[PDB]
């Protein structure tokens, strides 16, 4: 039949408001008061923000308001934090114990400050080496936005081969989290002095060097 | 919350029938029928394929099933077909003001051989500590299907409270790669006996454990 109409957006700004209408029909959003609103951050599990058009779980953000106007219903997200950058969904009872969901709205929160990456470079630890492999890891983290390049260096002459960068997941903030790795056999590991990892983000480059001299 | 756990990756083939489990934390379960299965596609809405334990709503083919014994609600795709590929969540009504989901499965149809992780844990670098900074990273490498569950522990006590996980990416070997971490301070690092990164990937569960045998 139909799947509730929702717009792919709600671009608010830090503090500023945003309200998300979701248009239903007679058959559902018309003749029943069973509208739920979900707050799904990318690939995660969905949570019950609004549960009966307006009314939230005792464990939801103080001002995440909602309503119904006849065939269209809404969510007054008014306390613009950024935690909530996500995909939101509506859902209405209709026929016999049947529930239909929305298209999805993709809320986006603007004028977030530029976060610039914390680069931490890792050397193979003993256990790894006991087995006679030696991988290295460049954890690129806590940044905004999420377009970054990670350039490994053998030493000068770039070791960008055997590399496996694995790009950026928003983390418990809405600040990113990328990784990249080098497979080294301990031989090459004990070959050529220093290695690098150079995370270039929005112009600001960061290069971290590990050398074989530590305490394992 | 996630007070109902699901197999991170659940998979078969065109023909392989696939059972997912939503196991309950709930000292409630049994005093319920209300387990509900929500299938999901890639940038599609959750789609409520099973209601209160047994009953499919219209257009949910009779070969999606629901069963629940003790704590574990269960669902069976009773003859996997291609676009059964999807993230399957489980709801439980719990009371009101509290409507909680499982963490989502992932029905993969295998078109590649299965690949159990290569969980390579790393310990806080010396120079890294040389700044008063202690971060552990648990590079999960080389899995298929691309879904995994990382836990972090210390001294027989789970540490839910310091971690980030990324989201499995496709490496040039069509094998997936994740990261994950526990960023802290030399105090919490130092004051402890062990630090196990645990990782689970359908069936196989591998725990790698580091120790605070630090230098300076």
């Amino acid at each position: 039949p139909s799947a509730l109409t929702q717009p792919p957006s709600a671009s608010g700004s830090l503090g500023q408001s945003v309200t998300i209408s979701c248009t239903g029909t007679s058959s559902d959003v018309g003749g029943y008061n069973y509208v739920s609103w979900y707050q799904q951050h990318a690939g995660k599990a969905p949570k019950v923000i609004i549960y009966e058009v307006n009314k939230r779980p005792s464990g939801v953000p103080d001002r995440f308001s909602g309503s119904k106007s006849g065939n269209t219903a809404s969510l007054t997200v008014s306390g613009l934090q950024a935690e909530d950058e996500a995909d939101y969904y509506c859902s209405s009872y209709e026929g016999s114990d049947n529930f239909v969901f929305g298209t999805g709205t993709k809320v986006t929160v603007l004028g977030q400050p530029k976060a610039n990456p914390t680069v931490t470079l890792f050397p193979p630890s003993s256990e790894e080496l006991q087995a006679n492999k030696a991988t290295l890891v460049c954890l690129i983290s806590d940044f905004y936005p999420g377009a970054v390049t990670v350039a490994w260096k053998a030493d000068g002459s770039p070791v960008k081969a055997g590399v496996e960068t694995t790009k950026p997941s928003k983390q418990s903030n809405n600040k990113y989290a990328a990784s990249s790795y080098l497979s080294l056999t301990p031989e090459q590991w004990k070959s050529h002095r220093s290695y690098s990892c150079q995370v270039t983000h929005e112009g600001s480059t960061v290069e971290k060097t590990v050398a074989p001299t530590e305490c394992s | 919350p996630s007070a109902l756990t699901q197999p991170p990756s659940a998979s078969g083939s065109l023909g392989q029938s696939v059972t997912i489990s939503c196991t309950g934390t709930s000292s409630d379960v049994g005093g319920y029928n209300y387990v509900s299965w929500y299938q999901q596609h890639a940038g599609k809405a959750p789609k409520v394929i099973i209601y209160e334990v047994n009953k499919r709503p219209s257009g949910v083919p009779d070969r999606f099933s629901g069963s629940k014994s003790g704590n574990t609600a269960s669902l069976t795709v009773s003859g996997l077909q291609a676009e059964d590929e999807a993230d399957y969540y489980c709801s439980s009504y719990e009371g009101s003001d509290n409507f909680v989901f499982g963490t989502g499965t992932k029905v993969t149809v295998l078109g590649q051989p299965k690949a159990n992780p290569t969980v390579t844990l790393f310990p806080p670098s010396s120079e890294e500590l040389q700044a008063n900074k202690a971060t552990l990273v648990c590079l999960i490498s080389d899995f298929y299907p691309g879904a995994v569950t990382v836990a972090w522990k210390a001294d027989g006590s789970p540490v839910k409270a310091g971690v980030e996980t990324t989201k499995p990416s496709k490496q040039s070997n069509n094998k997936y790669a994740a990261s994950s971490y526990l960023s802290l301070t030399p105090e919490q690092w130092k004051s402890h006996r062990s630090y196990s990164c645990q990782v689970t990937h359908e069936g196989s569960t591998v725990e790698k454990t580091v120790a605070p045998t630090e230098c300076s």
């Binding site: 859902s91 529930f99 | 009504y93 009101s96």
Partner: peptide
């Protein structure tokens, strides 16, 4: 959803 739960409703009912």
């Amino acid at each position: 959803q739960x409703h009912x």
